[PDB]
Structure 1
């Protein structure tokens, strides 16, 4: 077993000299993610703010090929609520994957910054009911798009939902790579790293992942939004969580949680996966209470939603 390189240097290939790196944004799958700038990569923009991923020096040849294969798959996505590919630098080392910049970073750190006693609070109130419903619809729209494309996320969490400059939330990294230093994972002997606190009971039991188990995870992201990204099942160990959820347990509603969001979570956490809503059903439920631009950009209102 060894992967074939599927990446074709085509219209997505960007000259290395067009990319300038500004600062580190943090380790992602394969390597470091940087904030940068890209010259003449989008028609009508002389310079575009970008996120740039490099592949680490410690990576095997197989990992370097897999990195580019992941970028090649992204060429097929055009959803406003999924972080997009902008270009690839495959000529020489280090290989670079250029993506749209999500200027407010991951949803987990963004939510934690809005806590009243947070040292990095930006002087704005925590999410309003309207803002939380908007986030829910955006995440659900991106997930509905991925489902239509036959992708099961398997790792949906606030840590990998991303926030743009205008506060739009989008689906970030849905790859299979699991960071060994991420406490959101549990090392299960002979099962690898598992995001147990975000997993559906059937996934914990049988190892099955479907769009219905992604809906369970979506309910947990709603819980992170309404708790300002508290750790789910705080006080319970990974083993205690596995038993609790498999037995039919689910998260307590955070203090003074809005009723509409509590209702959404409860739907996501039905024990029978067939009773959970679909991501298209989530967007349909929330569509009348969204920003006026939503139908112009959503997968839900697009001609592709068939």
Structure 2
């Protein structure tokens, strides 16, 4: 059932130029490209362009476009957004905003003291960490408001803009440089075990509450510059540790307010964990002045 985006979201094919491949997405390759006159005030804009694999069935091709129509309804400064779609002709293209600094996991790793790709920037300050935290929690609040359960929130699944704003978004690369971030629990499916709440591991259920747990892990990744959670434990060990009530070690030289927030996320009982809106409420008093201008939290949409 092909459901198409509004006229405003259709992009003339001639306005998109694919430049190089960024990597694999759920339906196929993702490319970095240029889109002309796609954003007001900009003659050209760097974008990420998704396509469906040429081996995909018609059904999968239709599903690829229908998903873009869904993603079209996710409009929040703290969520990577759909800029447009070339639905007519082959191949169909879903144009997404390109985050200048890529995913958060790779960005954090580049900030390490001896990283070869170190931007010449210092690891995030307390202030920047709290800002990132509120942006992530805010985008997740928006998504949860849309009844979306991420199921794989992690720094690898967040992206960094040119001004360092962190947004919820990923192309669909479970298998990538981060394949090791997933494990076939019981020889079954690939699960992001080191990011999963104890109840998800034990019963396979995922909720916004399990998303909150993962959010705590993301905060932890910011503090550790994205080390592997429970790096000293094997996948099997992580399963037992976490199901037994274990959680990550409180980061060093980090305020009680922050570590406590992390501890709340890691509450064993999902019911005891904060909601994403509560997370933002908790950090709202010390954020960049633009925050109220763009957050779902301070929006008329937060109902």
Secondary structure of 1:73 counterpart: helix
- Residue 22 (structure 1) aligns with: 19
Secondary structure of 1:42 counterpart: coil
Distance 1:148 1:130, change over 3 A: same
Shift of 1:48: 1.9
Shift of 1:213: 0.5
Name the count of aligned residue pairs. 303
Distance 1:57 1:189, change over 3 A: farther
Could you tell me the TM-score, scaled by structure 2's length? 0.94
Shift of 1:40: 1.3
Secondary structure of 2:127 counterpart: helix
Shift of 1:6: 2.7
Secondary structure of 1:183 counterpart: helix
Alpha-carbon distance in structure 2 between the residues aligned to 1:115 and 1:258: 21
Which has the higher mean CA deviation after the structures are superposed, 59-68 or 242-251? 59-68
> Aligned Cα RMSD in Å?
2.0
Structure 1 stretches lacking a partner, 5+ long: none
Alpha-carbon distance in structure 2 between the residues aligned to 1:171 and 1:15: 27
Which has the higher mean CA deviation after the structures are superposed, 119-128 or 9-18? 9-18
Distance 1:190 1:240, change over 3 A: closer
Alpha-carbon distance in structure 2 between the residues aligned to 1:146 and 1:113: 28
In 2, are the aligned partners of 1:137 and 1:283 still within 8 Å (CA)? yes
Alpha-carbon distance in structure 2 between the residues aligned to 1:193 and 1:233: 18
After superposition, the C-alpha distances for 1:198-251 in whole angstroms (9 at most, x for unaligned) are: 011111111111111100000000011000000001121211111111110111
Structure 2 stretches lacking a partner, 5+ long: none
Distance 1:119 1:174, change over 3 A: closer
Shift of 1:33: 2.0
Which has the higher mean CA deviation after the structures are superposed, 6-15 or 218-227? 6-15
In 2, are the aligned partners of 1:156 and 1:174 still within 8 Å (CA)? no
In 2, are the aligned partners of 1:155 and 1:174 still within 8 Å (CA)? no
